[PDB]
């Protein structure tokens, strides 16, 4: 996976070993750090479409993961195409949604399936973009399949958090059947934070045996000037930034920034 | 163990399951949180004795643990008596020091061996005292064996930390062969913090099997007025408080307070 630490043989790529705990860790993130529940994310994007008079029918979802946002869009009656680089994540998305969405294994940046009325990318997937250059190339791929005036909504963890909050701190929990640790490290003059994730899964209740699994996730911070510059060059001169899928403009307490990009029109 | 959470059958008392990782966790605490290395603790207590003209020969050490402070005192030529409630901790202290100190298994408060010229209690052992009442009873036991003008030096984690720092936060580390989590919880109107400690010990390098162990430690906060009141009632009207085994008076950044109590004289 481009942009992730070079590591030994048999070391998992992000989500290659942890896909089967992802939904549980999302429930934890919602309860602990303020990650937005998917129904609210879907309410927000629908409100954004309605406020522009967009008769959105076809939605392209990037980095769909296990399909938590995909299922909201499918339930609401959209014709959903959903893409992700991870075969383990996609297998869970297919279990959740079945044939009600069209799934593709694609590593961004790469050409995207044509025909959408709107594009979404939820839950900080864009923090895996390896560079401002790659981010711009991914935004170009989106612009290619969106008509003038159409919208792309995505969220990222705010740049300071990957350097000054989580920054170099540690979080963990012991839930008995599973214990997990996130150890964040960010070197002085880099734009990224390495998250060393470790988990221990109990073999059986009432016994003390566990299996340990580790994954390293490199997360890149993008400041507002970089997002705006790459968006403009990609064909989204208009970009706005909100606080975590609410209509409140982003402020200094925002942890998850929701960017609403509008495709250039005439 | 009085003052510790009532828990199920087969749940370890403090240090009953973790004595064999204690020295390693002290090395971690020294590196991570600023716990004072034992040679410096010993330098500080010796400087305090010299500043009073005390020809200290016999030292009583309370809550000696695995003997890290005991070994400093023995090396420096003192005649050391050392006591602790924990058979697992004392077995490690005897491995370290052998017959060069006189060890007793005693749970404080209780009568102490007579004859000391000075008493010490290092590394926050007094935060296990179950109440201000118990603390006072332990101080009385010390006063009983100390002559007029003699000193008792002990340290405690500062009251605010057990309510406002560690307070309700989490710390953890994954070191490969051992991973550990401290999960601190402190209810609104209590004077104590429960530390849920969990560790996972690797069976062998190059394999993913671990064994999990948990211990719960209830730590009590004592404010300055309480320490001073119980010390006075016990026969130590003079009490002074320093920052972590330096000659600097305690301040608002002090995490480990070093109390120097002087036995009443005429
Ligand atoms: N360059 C890239 N191309 C495609 N998928 C990517 C990617 N970088 C990261 N991902 C995917 O981004 C996801 C991040 S987790 C977010 C999942 C989902 N959007 C949700 O709302 O829960 C993972 O499934 C990961 O495999
Ligand atoms: N009431 C009590 N009576 C005796 N020992 C006690 C006690 N409460 C706690 N302890 C002991 O206090 C120790 C705390 S760890 C500190 C060990 C040592 N003084 C050092 O400098 O490293 C443990 O060994 C524990 O068993």
With H, G, I as helix, E, B as strand and everything else as coil, classify residue A122. Answer: coil
C-beta separation of A258 from A243 below 8 A: yes
C-beta separation of A220 from A192 below 8 A: yes
Q: Tokens 């023995």 appear where? A: B74
Check pocket membership of B67 for ligand 2, CB cut-off 6 A: no
B209 interaction partners in chain A (CB closer than 8 Å): 209-212
| Token pair recorded at residue A258 | 């929701």
Q: What is the 3-state secondary structure (H, E, C) of chain B?
A: CCCCCCCCCCCCCCCCCCHHHHHHHHHHHHHHCCCCCHHHHHHHHHHHHHHCCCCCCEEEEECCCCCHHHHHHHHCCCEEEEEECCHHHHHHHHHHHHHHEEEEECCCCCCCCCCCCEEEECCCHHHHCCCHHHHHHHHHHHHHHCCCCCEEEEEEECHHHHCCCCCCCEEEEECCCEEEEEEEECCCCCCEEEEEEEEEEECCCCCCEEEEEEEEEEEECCCHHHHHHHHHHCCCCEEEEEECCCCCECCCCCCEEEEEEECCCC
C-beta separation of B146 from B56 below 8 A: no
Catalogue the long-range contacts made by B86-90 (C-beta closer than 8 Å, 24 or more residues apart): B86/B13, B86/B14, B86/B15, B86/B16, B86/B19, B88/B15, B88/B16, B88/B19, B88/B20, B89/B15, B89/B19, B89/B22, B89/B64, B89/B65, B90/B64
Interface test with A, best of B11, B171, B172 (most A CBs within 10 A): B172
B214 interaction partners in chain A (CB closer than 8 Å): 174
Residue nearest ligand 1's atom 14 by CA: A125
**Contact at CB, A200 and B212, closer than 8 angstroms:** yes
Which residue from B minimizes the CA distance to A209?
B211
Could you state, in order of their start, the residue ranges of all structural domains in chain A?
19-158+222-262, 162-220
For domain A19-158+222-262, the question of CATH label 3.40.50.1260 is answered with no
| Token pair recorded at residue B19 | 């004595």
C-beta separation of B231 from B239 below 8 A: yes
With H, G, I as helix, E, B as strand and everything else as coil, classify residue A45. Answer: helix
Residues β-bridged to residue B62: B83
How are strands ordered across the β-sheet holding B151-157? B101-105, B79-84, B58-62, B118-121, B151-157, B256-262, B238-243
Largest CA distance in chain B: 67
| Token pair recorded at residue A140 | 């170009």
Largest CA distance in chain A: 67
B11 interaction partners in chain A (CB closer than 8 Å): none
C-beta separation of A99 from A131 below 8 A: no
Pick the ligand that lies closest to the CA of residue A137. 1
Spell out the residues 6+ positions from residue A74 whose beta carbon is closer than 8 angstroms to its own: A80, A97, A100, A101
| Cα–Cα separations (whole angstroms), residue A23 to A15, A16, A101, A181, B6 | 11, 14, 19, 16, 34
| Token pair recorded at residue B246 | 């330096």
**Contact at CB, B196 and A174, closer than 8 angstroms:** yes
With H, G, I as helix, E, B as strand and everything else as coil, classify residue A115. Answer: coil
With H, G, I as helix, E, B as strand and everything else as coil, classify residue A16. Answer: coil
Residues β-bridged to residue A62: A83
Q: Tokens 């975590």 appear where? A: A244
Pairing of strands B170-174, B178-185: antiparallel
Residue A42: name the closest of A242, A245, A243 by CA. Answer: A245
User: Which residues does chain B break after (C to N > 2.5 Å)?
Assistant: none
* Distance (Å, whole) CA B72 – CA B102: 14
Check pocket membership of B122 for ligand 2, CB cut-off 6 A: yes
C-beta separation of B157 from B124 below 8 A: yes
Pick the ligand that lies closest to the CA of residue A16. 1
How far apart are the two ends of chain A, measured CA to CA in Å? 38
Q: Where are the alpha helices (DSSP H) in chain A?
A: 19-32, 38-51, 68-75, 87-97, 132-145, 224-233
* Distance (Å, whole) CA B179 – CA B176: 7
Which residue from B minimizes the CA distance to A181?
B172
* Distance (Å, whole) CA A197 – CA A212: 11
B108 Cα: distance to centroid of ligand 2 (angstroms)? 10
A212 interaction partners in chain B (CB closer than 8 Å): 179, 200, 202, 208-210
Interface test with B, best of A200, A202, A213 (most B CBs within 10 A): A200
Least Cα separation, residue A120 to chain B (angstroms): 34
Pairing of strands A256-262, A79-84: unpaired
| Cα–Cα separations (whole angstroms), residue A64 to A85, B136, B165, B203 | 9, 61, 38, 37
Experimental technique: X-ray
B75 Cα: distance to centroid of ligand 2 (angstroms)? 21
C-beta separation of B241 from B20 below 8 A: no
A125 Cα: distance to centroid of ligand 1 (angstroms)? 5
How far apart are the two ends of chain B, measured CA to CA in Å? 38
What length is written for chain A? Answer: 266
Burial of B193 (0-12, 13-18, 19+ CB in 10 A): buried
* Distance (Å, whole) CA B190 – CA A125: 42
* Distance (Å, whole) CA B175 – CA A170: 13
**Contact at CB, A173 and B183, closer than 8 angstroms:** yes
* Distance (Å, whole) CA B41 – CA B245: 6
* Distance (Å, whole) CA A209 – CA A218: 30
Q: What is the resolution of this structure in A?
A: 1.4
| CATH code of the domain occupying B162-220 | 2.20.25.110
Residues β-bridged to residue A91: none
Spell out the residues 6+ positions from residue B201 whose beta carbon is closer than 8 angstroms to its own: B177, B178, B210, B211, B213
With H, G, I as helix, E, B as strand and everything else as coil, classify residue A7. Answer: coil
């Amino acid at each position: 996976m481009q942009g992730q630490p070079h590591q030994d043989a048999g070391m998992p790529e992000p989500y290659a070993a942890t896909a089967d705990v992802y939904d549980r860790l999302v429930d934890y993130a919602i309860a602990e750090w303020g990650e937005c529940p998917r129904p609210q994310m879907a309410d927000f994007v629908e409100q954004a479409w309605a406020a522009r008079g967009h008769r959105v029918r076809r939605v392209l979802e990037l980095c769909c993961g296990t399909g938590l946002m995909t299922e909201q869009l499918v339930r609401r009656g959209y014709e959903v195409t959903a893409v992700d680089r991870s075969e383990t994540m996609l297998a869970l998305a297919k279990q959740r949604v079945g044939g009600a969405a069209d799934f593709h294994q694609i590593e961004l940046p790469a050409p995207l399936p044509d025909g959408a009325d709107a594009v979404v990318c939820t839950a900080a997937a864009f923090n895996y973009q390896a560079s401002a250059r790659s981010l711009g190339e991914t935004l170009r791929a989106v612009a290619t399949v969106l008509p003038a005036g159409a919208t792309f909504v995505f969220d990222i963890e705010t740049a300071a958090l990957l350097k000054g909050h989580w920054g170099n701190r540690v979080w963990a929990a012991d839930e008995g059947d599973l214990a997990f640790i996130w150890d964040f490290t960010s070197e002085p003059d880099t734009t990224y934070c390495d998250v060393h994730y470790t988990q221990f899964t109990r073999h059986e209740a009432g016994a003390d045996a566990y299996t340990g699994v580790r994954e390293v996730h490199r997360l890149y911070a993008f400041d507002h000037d970089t997002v705006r510059a790459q968006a403009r060059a990609a064909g989204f001169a208009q970009a706005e930034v909100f606080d975590n899928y609410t209509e409140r403009p982003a402020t200094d307490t925002t942890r998850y920034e929701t960017w609403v990009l509008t495709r250039d029109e005439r």
